[model samples]
Target: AKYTGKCTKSKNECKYKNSAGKDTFIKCPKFDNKKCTKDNNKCTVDTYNNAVDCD
Candidate 1:
């Protein structure tokens, strides 16, 4: 994914290229304050740490 426009403090717009080179916008996920952990390292940790609140 590539950033199409200027980044901001509250929001950002990203463009993802598919196999056909088509660009699409993907909104960023809302922030959550809860801390997430894997059960047996089955998956990666959640992107958001325990500092922000979810929408």
Candidate 2:
């Protein structure tokens, strides 16, 4: 049997407090605007010459 797990994250404050003892917000890689190619099932952040954008 094969197992796969997926995790989703929303815009939120970072759990670790900064030097000021305040929660900081961290920005992750932009993925909502990306598209996927017809030949591949995985999405990536690297740019390719002929690869389709992540969806």
Candidate 3:
């Protein structure tokens, strides 16, 4: 699912605000963007190197 929510990061844990204004967890080593997307039921994010998945 694609969301237009803002993203916030806390160390290795990255989270994005949902459309419902809820905090959603994502599997990211680090977040380099203000927005994020979850595809195929898996949350992934991009780091300084490339795309990463902590799950």
Candidate 4:
């Protein structure tokens, strides 16, 4: 699973990545974002998501 499944103010604060090196998209939170790594990669003044690094 490459996506971080992170959620921020946007709710669309989901992650993206490659499947077998192929790009894919799935608003699916298969993995726990909380379990993923963290960074200032979340949201704006409205709110924020516990986001992980894109890498």
C-alpha lDDT score of every prediction, in listed order: 0.30, 0.31, 0.42, 0.35
Clash pairs detected, candidate 3 = none
Ranked candidates, highest TM-score first: 1, 3, 2, 4
TM-score of 2: 0.26
lDDT of 1: 0.30
* Model 3 CA lDDT for position 55: 25
List TM-scores for all candidates, in order: 0.28, 0.26, 0.27, 0.22
Residue 20, model 1: Cα distance from true site in angstroms: 2.3
Model 2 pairs whose backbones collide:
34-54, 34-55, 35-53, 35-54, 35-55, 36-54, 36-55
Stretch of 10 with least lDDT, candidate 3: 3-12
On lDDT, the leading prediction is: 3
lDDT of 4 by residue, 1-55 (tens): 2233333333333344435765432232436652322223541221245444321
lDDT of 1 at 8: 26
Of 1 and 3, the candidate ranking higher by lDDT: 3
> In model 4, where is the ten-residue run with the lowest total lDDT?
38-47
List ranges where model 4 is wrong by over 4 Å: 1-15, 28-55
